[PDB]
Amino acid sequence: PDIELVYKNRGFYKHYGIRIGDQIYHLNSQDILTTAITGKSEFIKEQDDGNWTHAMTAPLDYFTEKYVNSKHIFSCTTNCETIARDIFPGQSGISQSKALGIVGLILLSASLLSLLAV
């Protein structure tokens, strides 16, 4: 399963997402510094609005090997239950909360490092 990383440029940083079909998984955040420092994040899964930019496509491993191999916690109210099926298909023994942890760290890390690219 090649995974597509996407982003929206918010000028002072890039806000990243994972695009699966016509859906984007991303953090419900307006600023990377606030999210990083407060240490908690809420996930959204949202219809693709057409305003996302491709970053790269790669096996999940390309990302988790960077950003995953931290104390931040990641939650979702509704509609993110599909994340294990979407990003970790076939693999049982992976819960919502865990999958969210892995993908959350990828997105947080990429957004934090984007401070250098402004």
Added chain:
Amino acid sequence: PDIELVYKNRGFYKHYGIRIGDQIYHLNSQDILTTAITGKSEFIKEQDDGNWTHAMTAPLDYFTEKYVNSKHIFSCTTNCETIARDIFPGQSGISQSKALGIVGLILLSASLLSLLAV
């Protein structure tokens, strides 16, 4: 040349260095956010004071593949001229300024991501 990454924990982030023998290359910075956002950094090479913590040892590639593969600029007044010989031995066609760019991004990136580990 296996490369040793070291750090000092400043509580709200980790400040990283490369230890070569009894020397530490690191950024002359008191805070990661100030350095990241201002977009410039000064290198120091300092005698090891005995107060650094081992992070990991690995070929430079383990690091550059993460943090290098950005617009930040990296300078040094004196005494860092040894960085190409120390961190990139044998390899000609690598200047002070370049070597500093590669190592600087490793240190900046690791310190930025350490915000997640507090």
